Design a binder for this molecule. Sequence first.
Ligand SMILES: COc1cc2c(cc1-c1c(C)noc1C)[nH]c1ccnc(-c3c(C4CC4)n[nH]c3C)c12
Length: 112
Amino acid sequence: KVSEQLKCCSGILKEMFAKKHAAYAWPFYKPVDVEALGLHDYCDIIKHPMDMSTIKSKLEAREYRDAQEFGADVRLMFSNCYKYNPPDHEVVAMARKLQDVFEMRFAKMPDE
Ligand SMILES: COc1cc2c(cc1-c1c(C)noc1C)[nH]c1ccnc(-c3c(C4CC4)n[nH]c3C)c12
């Protein structure tokens, strides 16, 4: 059950990195570079940054013991985006689209 769940997690993350979703996924590929983007309030607002490359590294290191922990990091990544940015920002619209990709497939997680 757990190994199967973690293969589903790995599949979902590989899809989120696929070219077909890249026009909206790309801001989530790497950690937010606070200095490069001039976001001098980012760390005052976001206490736990997360991004897709960090999630990939944690899967590769077998840090997630089950799908719930993996899902919590994916949601943390999106929640940080919804917390920091104005609700009408282009990046929030991109987040909603990538989160729909994620939620619809994560809902199909094997359950036994
Ligand atoms: C505005 O939010 C981001 C922009 C970029 C990013 C992360 C975020 C981000 C996420 C996710 N959640 O919160 C924040 C903050 N990472 C990049 C790397 C390079 N350029 C860009 C870029 C963009 C992106 C289309 C939105 N607009 N203008 C530039 C300079 C970004």
